[PDB]
């Protein structure tokens, strides 16, 4: 809420590159919760892969969702209707890997 439907934080923070991006809260099945700063229109696949890849998980075994909403590879927070600090849960796609 700035005037209408925006957050008025960009004119304070933004020391990284282009002001600031948006961070999601990833909930892993190991209860690991990681904060990812992706751009509004960033492939949430990348988000999914970052978690899985570094933590040693196969992408076919894990699904990332926004409040139970299945994230697709070419789907981004912008498209799904999320913003900074939104939450994404990890659930099992197929058999464990």
């Amino acid at each position: 809420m700035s005037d209408q439907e925006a957050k008025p934080s960009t004119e304070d923070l933004g020391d990284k590159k282009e002001g600031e991006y948006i961070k999601l809260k990833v909930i892993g099945q190991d209860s690991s919760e990681i904060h990812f700063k992706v751009k509004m229109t960033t492939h949430l696949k990348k988000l999914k892969e970052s978690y899985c890849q570094r933590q040693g998980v196969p992408m076919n075994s894990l699904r990332f969702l926004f409040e139970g909403q299945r994230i697709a590879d070419n789907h981004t927070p912008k498209e799904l209707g999320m913003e900074e600090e939104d939450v994404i849960e990890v659930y099992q796609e197929q058999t464990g890997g």
Binding site: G28, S32, I34, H35, K39, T41, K46, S50, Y51, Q55
Partner: peptide
């Protein structure tokens, strides 16, 4: 007067580089 205490940290995953 305040002192810092070390915390225990679980899984730390890194983030990728931004799109858009």
């Amino acid at each position: 007067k305040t002192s810092v205490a070390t915390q225990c940290d679980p899984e730390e995953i890194i983030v990728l580089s931004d799109s858009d």
